């Protein structure tokens with residue numbers, strides 16, 4: 022194959038740095054013919070499954086139950102059809118019966134390097150070798166975004182249980198960038214951060230797309246201009262936004278920089294296994310030789326053809342601790358296999374990830390993702406930057422209830438101008454989704470902003486009824 | 496000398512682990528005759544000063560101004576008398592004139608690994624080699640606290656600009672412990688942490704002494720018992736507490752574990768250069784071959800005899816990036832040179848560090864440190880766990896104004912019992928300090944707790960006058 026440092030268990034040269042003129046960290050692995058890579062992926066898949074059968078009674082029990090033995094993995098078609106998907110509920114049960122890390126940990130207790138998790142929570146017990154595998158994978162993909170040694174990288178996501186921040190930091194460290202782990206979560210942090218970004222002038226920023234928006238309002242409230250932060254790029258994970266039309270454009274305009282989309286799941290660190298590149302800057306590429314991504318039909322867990330929508334199912338190819346083999350994301354995406362501007366021979370998620378299938382709600386037989394509402398509103402000049410979707414999953418909904426913020430300039434323009442925006446927001450959303458949308462305007466900057474993931478859906482039956490009844494009276 | 500890995504610039508074997516039966520990480524460096532170590536320290540001091548003269552125009556300019564050349568460093572007595580102390584104000588000025596890291600950075604820009612700082616803030620630009628020097632120094636000292644490979648270490652301090660959390664994490668990583676960087680700072684964290692500590696059962700905890708107290712109230716509010724967290728120890732830095740009589744005893748009782756004191760300054764990472772050991776568990780030892788600590792008379796910056804109080808002045812012996820040479824802490828301590836129970840041949844701070852000299856206030860010609868008030872109150876069964884000291888530095892104070900919380904059981908006992916506590920708190924404080932103390936009781940759990948450093952002094956002239964006038968009327 023000629024694939025750079027292709028071995029299981031993986032063991033990367035910590036001193037390797039690509040030549041300054043190279044677009045790719047690993048030219049072979051990244052640009053080789055896709056059919057050549059798929060051969061080696063299957064080869065690795067066999068190694069991983071044999072490794073899990075040997076060290077994980079979770080996989081040994083699960084596979085035996087579905088009638089699977091690693092010797093039956095003889096093609097990628099055998100993998101999708103014979104190998105049962107892992108659910109997050111299966112991990113929880115394994116952790117409850119085999120505490121703290123479950124019967125899929127594989128490595129001895131003495132190998133565990135870092136303890137992280139979800140916020141029943143699942144604990145991540147990551148071995149020393151996996152932490153190195155994650156740092157190398159992430160430095161590689163960050164290089165793909167045009168981030169370089171010596172660049173100041175601001176990691177502005179909470180450093181706690183959450184894998185996002187640690188993963189971007191490990192990549193920055195391995196990339197030989199100046200890692201700036203400012204973090205997030207504490208009151209007073211954002212006001213101080215904007216001063217640090219104005220002083221330090223970083224080449225790159227990491228966090229959630231929501232935080233980047235909130236930080237520009239803080240920069241402006243703090244009489245600082247966020248275009249003067251010297252940013253060449255901002256790269257995000259954690260939620261949709263970075264591949265959302267009006268959201269991506271708002272962030273790139275506010276900072277005068279490029280926006281990159283990345284991120285699968287925390288269970289799937291190196292989570293940057295799905296990430297956009299400097300040239301293929303829309304959506305994300307599936308870095309197949311790091312983690313094998315399958316976009317599947319949720320009805321049978323088999324790959325959907327390219328150009329079709331489905332759910333990402335992921336498999337670690339370079340992890341010995343808590344390896345995930347065919348973990349069901351529960352997310353919705355579309356994947357294609359056409360030529361990429363960067364020249365990387367990987368499948369792509371051209372519109373990134375739409376959201377979690379469970380987050381979707383139905384109004385008059387029409388399926389709606391919260392990200393579709395966020396996209397339509399952000400493409401409006403009069404929109405204030407925040408909204409809430411008020412629903413009920415207990416009874417059928419005839420209309421969409423929205424609490425939308427107008428801009429301070431729309432507010433300053435008077436009652437008639439506010440009313441003109443409320444009606445135009447309602448119409449736009451109706452034209453986009455094909456559903457009746459009731460809009461209630463709230464005061465500018467009244468809706469809570471976040472430095473983490475935006476939770477815009479209020480699924481309470483009493484809140485829904487109170488709002489509908491109030492909107493019927495007005 | 497036979498000192499393990501004694502070299503400048505330092506370059507530690509990342510695979511070294513002491514034998515399981517050893518009390519010391521480095522038997523020679525830690526237990527050698529003090530006069531033998533002081534010879535090699537002076538030798539290193541010469542190397543460091545030559546290194547700074549060559550790479551830092553900040554030190555070249557400062558030393559030339561004080562009439563000092565590194566060739567004049569011919570004894571430890573030459574060091575204290577000839578070498579001018581560095582002030583935090585000098586670092587700020589150097590950073591403003593030579594942004595971002597100042598003219599004392601020494602290493603090239605390309606060597607900077609991590610960016611941290613203070614919260615005018617000073618930026619820390621720490622090189623890759625220094626980060627390794629810090630991780631090794633900290634693993635060594637944590638081993639001294641009886642912390643071992645495979646032990647689950649909860650790092651519960653904010654992961655941001657602040658060096659404390661990163662320093663404990665780097666030590667845990669190098670110690671081959673299971674590093675658990677939960678962090679601090681965000682609302683909802685403490686309630687979730689107590690659940691993680693009950694589930695995970697860590698051998699060690701890191702944070703501020705204030706946070707450990709707050710976390711026990713959260714554990715109890717959450718109907719969990721903090722003695723059931725499996726803790727063998729809690730080790731703290733950031734503020735006094737861990738060497739404060741009633742505070743140390745309250746924490747050890749609440750958790751059923753040992754408490755260790757550590758920590759100099761963030762500018763002085765590896766900040767654990769002052770730290771207690773499993774056997775010398777009261778106060779802190781000065782790990783002289785890591786950082787050279789001098790307890791000086793603030794009037795002349797010369798060492799005070801053992802058994803006398805003074806200000807810690809620190810010098811890095813194993814740092815190439817932003818090396819600190821005779822940095823004035825502005826803190827107050829007492830140092831002695833008697834035999835230590837662990838058998839380490841180091842000077843000791845038997846009562847740790849009392850506080851920042853600037854934090855001290857005067858009432859009727861009597862000098863008081865906020866930690867003396869904290870100590871007296873914490874040694875009272877009826878004390879609720881929080882208080883505020885209300886002062887004025889604008890006019891002379893005749894009496895001490897205190898806002899003290901009683902316990903919920905003292906409150907439930909009625910008005911007479913609350914009044915009996917208010918008078919007894921006043922008397923105790925008067926007997927301790929020798930000053931009139933006016934006590935106002937506040938509602939139990941009304942005073943804000945913290946996961947960081949406790950700021951108990953309110954130095955406002957209007958607040959002081961309002962309180963005195965209110966206390967004169969009652």
Ligand SMILES: C[C@H](O)CC(=O)OP(=O)(O)OC[C@H]1O[C@@H](n2cnc3c(N)ncnc32)[C@H](O)[C@@H]1O
Nearest residue numbers: 184185258259260261283284285286287292374
């Ligand atoms: C540790 C990383 O930050 C990823 C992460 O947030 O892990 P979590 O377990 O906390 O959450 C994963 C879920 O967030 C979403 N999710 C994560 N990244 C997404 C993206 N780029 N686009 C659309 N949705 C995305 C997506 O629904 C994914 O399944």
Ligand SMILES: C[C@H](O)CC(=O)OP(=O)(O)OC[C@H]1O[C@@H](n2cnc3c(N)ncnc32)[C@H](O)[C@@H]1O
Nearest residue numbers: 658659732733734735757758759760761766848
């Ligand atoms: C990065 C480390 O946590 C140390 C730290 O907090 O660095 P900072 O620069 O943020 O603050 C240093 C000051 O906190 C105090 N300070 C720090 N540790 C102390 C202790 N153990 N006992 C008494 N006072 C102590 C002491 O006054 C010291 O000068």
